Amino acid sequence: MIAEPLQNEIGEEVFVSPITGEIHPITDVPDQVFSGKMMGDGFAILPSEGIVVSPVRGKILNVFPTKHAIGLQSDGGREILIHFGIDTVSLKGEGFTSFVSEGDRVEPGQKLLEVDLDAVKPNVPSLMTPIVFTNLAEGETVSIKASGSVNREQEDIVKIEK
């Protein structure tokens, strides 16, 4: 009855996969806020590609204080919070390069950050890059499909669905 494979052909819930790496449930993130969901729903990606595109750009809501994080909005319904690795904030983004100079209103994907993961990793306790969605049209559960490896710009990886 619980038909898990609700993948769909057009399984792109305004989500052109942001990074290539390994997906992990939000709970796995070594931080209370993320681990306990606190601000919303979401998941972690342990990244590989030092190139980060956007699930949706839509409209950049807020910039990074220390290049490691950003706030986005699709249209008016899904507001997103991103964090890139852990303690990268502390690292002052030493190895980061920001592509969006947060000119808010933009179309999806197109690189948010380029980030020297290779050099960042040894300088951080964890590479967990959590993505949280707050408002989530007050009912969108973040139905993870790709409970394993993930690749950039892919579809049917996570489904924001009721």
Q: Which residues contact 20 (CB under 8 A, 6 or more apart)?
A: 47, 48, 49, 150, 151, 152
State the Cα torsion 40-42-44-47 to the nearest 10°: -120
Q: Which residues contact 90 (CB under 8 A, 6 or more apart)?
A: none
> Rounded CA gap, 85 and 124, in Å?
8
CATH number, domain with residue 140:
2.70.70.10
Q: Which domain holds residue 59?
A: 1-162
Beta bridge partners of 115: 96
> Rounded CA gap, 102 and 73, in Å?
12
Q: Which residues contact 3 (CB under 8 A, 6 or more apart)?
A: none
> Rounded CA gap, 55 and 125, in Å?
25
User: Which residue in 83, 145, 152, 159 is the catalytic one?
Assistant: 83
Q: How many domains does the chain fold into?
A: 1
Helices of type H across the chain: 32-35, 117-120
> Rounded CA gap, 50 and 33, in Å?
25
State in Å, rounded, how far the first CA of the chain is from the last one: 17
**Side chain identity at residue 1, one-letter code:** M
Q: Quick check: is 83 catalytic?
A: yes
Query: Is there a contact between 115 and 18 (Cβ–Cβ < 8 Å)?
Result: no
Beta bridge partners of 132: 42, 81
